[PDB]
Amino acid sequence: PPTPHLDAIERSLRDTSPGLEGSVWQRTDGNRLDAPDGDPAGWLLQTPGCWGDAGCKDRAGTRRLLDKMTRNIADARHTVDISSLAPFPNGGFEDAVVDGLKASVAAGHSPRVRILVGAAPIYHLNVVPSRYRDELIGKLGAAAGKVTLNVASMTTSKTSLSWNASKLLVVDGKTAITGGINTNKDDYLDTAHPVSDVDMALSGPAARSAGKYLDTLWDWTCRNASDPAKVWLATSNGASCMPSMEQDEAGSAPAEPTGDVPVIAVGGLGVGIKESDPSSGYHPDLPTAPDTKCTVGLHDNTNADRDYDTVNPEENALRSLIASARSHVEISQQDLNATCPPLPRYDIRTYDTLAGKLAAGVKVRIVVSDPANARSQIKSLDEISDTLRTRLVALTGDNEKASRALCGNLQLASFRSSDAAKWADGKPYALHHKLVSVDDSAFYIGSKNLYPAWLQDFGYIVESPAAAQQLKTELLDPEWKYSQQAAATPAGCP
Ligand SMILES: O=P([O-])([O-])O[C@@H]1[C@H](O)[C@H](O)[C@@H](O)[C@H](O)[C@H]1O
16 A cells, blocks of 8 residues: 655655664554444544534543543553653543553553653642552552552753653553543543543554653663652662563564554654764754744754754654645644744744645645633734745745735634634633644644654654544544634735
8 A cells, every 4th residue: 555645754754863763763564543343433532522512511532532541451461651741640541540450450460560751840740759659559459569660750851841741551562542632630531621632542563663662761761760850760569660661572573463554653852862863864954044033042953953853753754744745734733833932933844844835735724722822822823824924935935926825725723622612611722632634644643742842752643545534524624614713814815
């Protein structure tokens, strides 16, 4: 089966981060999208799952998600590997972790279990690793004895704002859940106004891909627990740190296929883990596009740092995915722009890639979280359409060439999930996707935001017309049906 989008992407990843192939990024064949029998699109795990309902009474999406996490951990034979933004899994996320582990222990297994959270230098951890570990041990009861725990919170750069934001649940290196959904009960489960988000479930070689990525982070985490300012670590039963748990489980055996889906796993190492890819010949000429709204105090890793690209292939992977679009691009994000300062306002290359698509007649849709949320980082969606216009002029010369590209090919709106502008409690809709879909053939579902950020993130890029059709039917088309009544007509357009 031809994967023309994956191929372009792979080309860029190999040119950017050749040494990181097979740890921080990897293409594999033979994957399956882990849908429950009789629910073929059930691999797409959206929360909360209430299109057409501003009241959101039946959070079916959220319970499919929690039940899929529970079931996947319940099936664990050897390893469970969890990462998220802080806090550690709480509320129903914790329940799914505990419940699954008890099942695994009942079926006679002794699972090893790693749990990694990123934390900003500003963020105060209420439940620190030793308290989290103790809490799980109590909740596990008699089964704790069979469960080897590694619990850790990490910050990799204080001055350059880098910590883990990957959101992974990998089991036995065989199944993986990932997306934008943090294990934070208060955004998703305990509220009259839940965040909207999406994860995907998968099984096969690409689950091992995620595993080796987490090994890369645990290698750094284990080594740097010698510096409590960066890492807080707690193990149970007197266990060592486990930097290579996914590798141990994999062994010499190559991962067995479980379906026919081609996938590119790709993440990034942020700042402070590795300076550069020593084997990389990446030699871009980086844009010089000083921005109206902002200058950066901090050194701009997004727009002006060759080395940062070499140890962060997800950045260029997202740029390649957009660049691969021959027909149309759908972007659904919390934000395109970052709040600047401190971070650069936007990723110049992304916007240039998008402007180039606008000028070639490729259709571009951008849905972002409602600016009535700053959970958002722009005052008005004109910020995005203005930026695209400046970059269009910077490309085509004259304005009404850009206006022809912009006004004819751009859909831009804030996210709605029902006909209601907001929820019952008056709070607006918060969108937390990190999703890109291209030509109804290839899509990214993961944790890497399109706005500038220097965290460790990870996600999957799938090339499957049948899966993208499902993605289009279950998420993109509904989103646009409701979000177009919050759409912007860019300034200077009919
Ligand atoms: O996208 P994410 O990594 O899960 O978390 C987001 C970022 O951490 C960002 O700092 C904040 O401004 C957003 O409000 C969060 O949603």
